[PDB]
Every structure is written in structure tokens, then in C-alpha cells.
């Protein structure tokens, strides 16, 4: 499993979770969120070599095809697998609202 525990401890060239702090106002222009001012959203980056956490048969087949034909570029991509929600606080004018936004933080990744 290409999770945070493996990826953050180890040096990984290929698919893995990469740490990322997104600040809502500076990075997105989202002045509306009162808490948090930002969060560790993380993202996924790194090549997807043959057999590395293949999501599907097509990811296996595409990985085989790619690591066999040099003129071929078609390959699986490093994308989220496991994601956690994020609870936010904002005010609609003066009315406080709390929301648990789903799949906000990437905790693991796969090659799809």
C-alpha cells in the first residue's frame, strides 16, 4: 500500500504520497473559510512502472505495453486511493456553519 507511513519515511522515485500544505486564502483565493486557514491535503506524484500498485487489469496491461514498446507513452497514473475528510468552519454573514468535506486529504495512492 502506497500510504503516508511508507511514502513519508522512505525515498520513493515512483508513485507515492507527497506532502502538501494548501492555504485556503493565499493558494486558492478562498477568503470564506474561517478554520482551518489551511490543511495538509497531500497529492500524488511519481512514475507508474509495471506491477506497481495497479488499480486494474488495464493498469497491468498498460504497464506491460509501456515497459516493452519505447515509442509508446500510454501509461497508468499515480492517483489517490485512500482519502480522509476535513472539518471546516465558516460564517454565512454572522451565522456559523460547520461542514465535514469528504475526500480532502490523500492518505494513500495507486496506479490507475
Amino acid at each position: 500500500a502506497l500510504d503516508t507511513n511508507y511514502c513519508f519515511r522512505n525515498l520513493e522515485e515512483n508513485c507515492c504520497v507527497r506532502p502538501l500544505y494548501i492555504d485556503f486564502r493565499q493558494d486558492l483565493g478562498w477568503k470564506w473559510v474561517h478554520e482551518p486557514k489551511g490543511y495538509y491535503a497531500n497529492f500524488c506524484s511519481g512514475p507508474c512502472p509495471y506491477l506497481r500498485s495497479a488499480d486494474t487489469t488495464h493498469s497491468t496491461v498498460l504497464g506491460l505495453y509501456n515497459t516493452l514498446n519505447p515509442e509508446a507513452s500510454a501509461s497508468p497514473c499515480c492517483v489517490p486511493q485512500d482519502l480522509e475528510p476535513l472539518t471546516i468552519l465558516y460564517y454565512v454573514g454572522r451565522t456559523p456553519k460547520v461542514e465535514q468535506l469528504s475526500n480532502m486529504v490523500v492518505k494513500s495512492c495507486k496506479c490507475s
Partner: antibody
Amino acid sequence: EVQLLESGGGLVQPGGSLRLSCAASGFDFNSYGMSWVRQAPGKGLELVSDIVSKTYNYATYYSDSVKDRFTISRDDSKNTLYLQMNSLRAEDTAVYYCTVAPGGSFDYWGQGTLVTVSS
Amino acid sequence: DIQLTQSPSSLSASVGDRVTITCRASQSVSISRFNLMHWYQQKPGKAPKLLIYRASNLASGVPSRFSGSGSGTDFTLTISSLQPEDFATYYCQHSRESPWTFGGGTKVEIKR
């Protein structure tokens, strides 16, 4: 940074009117809700008027003590908060602070303008 | 309308002593894990300054000796080691529902 400067306070006859203003700088004025919080001499703090941003249709709310007599307004271009105080009474004598609440807390406060309601 | 009651109305405490002030709301000021109770300090001829936002978070530049806690209807402010400059009136305000109300204040005198 932030600076809040209020003016307009002074001696006013009971039944009279006054217009307080608040000059703001150092922050994203148009984005946040502004309020007027008053302090009668040797007494507590009373949020007497409030106004939200252009985003939430400049909606206002007033305390029961000043409803129908007071009017809170703003001028986003000039960065100014206003208070129309009509039919002023003795109990309206207090220091009037303009304050900024980006979320729930009054993050920034001015130094206040004194309003004295007397014959 | 939520109304706030602070106890005591005033106190004397020696320099170095731990001071505890309470605030009771008429209704809960909590919305999920977020506690919408804020604390101000007002020195004699000055405007109030924010010390603590959302029950326990210190406002920028406020010393480590200041702390807050609570949820629902009951909240606390603690000056862990009272200083002579801590002579002020302490206010609790809520941001749960309109109109936002303030507590009556707690006057803190230094006994010497």
C-alpha cells in the same frame, strides 16, 4: 498594521442626532463584517449594531436598545463604516468602538469616540 | 438570544498566583468540535484586545500564561502566573447566534 479611527462623537442634546464614522486601513475591508460596540461609563460592552460584507447582501442587525433609532452603513470604496444615531437618549452616552470580526471574534478595535447625551 | 454570565464579578490575586475566571452561556456555544467563546482584556483607558478565540486559541502576541478551555455552556480563562500588568477587566463574547452578546466582565485587581 490594522488601523480603525472613529470620529463624530461629542456633546448632543437629548432627542438629537449624530453621525459616527470609522476610517479603516491595513486589512481586506470589503471581505469582513464590521460592528459598533459601546461602553457606557463604568459599565460593560454592548454590541449595538452590525453589518456584513457585499457577499452577504450588507445585512444588518441591531440591539433592542437602538433598533429603529440607529442605522449602520458602510462605504467599501472609501473604507468607511457609519452610524446614524437618531432620537438620542441619556443611556446612549458611551464610548463607541468600531470593530472587525473576520469570523467570530473581534480581531481589531479602534480607540473609540465618546458620545455624551445631555441638555 | 444567548446571554453570558461571568463569575466572579471581581477578584484580587497576588503576583505569581493562578487566576481562574468562568463564563456561562444561557445555551450551548459549541458547533461540532468548535467552541464559539472568545475572551478580551480591557485595560482602564483602552479599547478591548482579543486574548483567546474559540475557547482555547491564544490571539497573536498574547503571553503563554493566558489560557482558555470549555465547551457547551461553561468556559474558563486562566492566567497561570499573574503579573502586575494583568490588571484589567476580562470579557467573554460568543459567536454562536445573532445577536452576539458579551458577559458583564470580571475585574482583576493585584493584591500586594
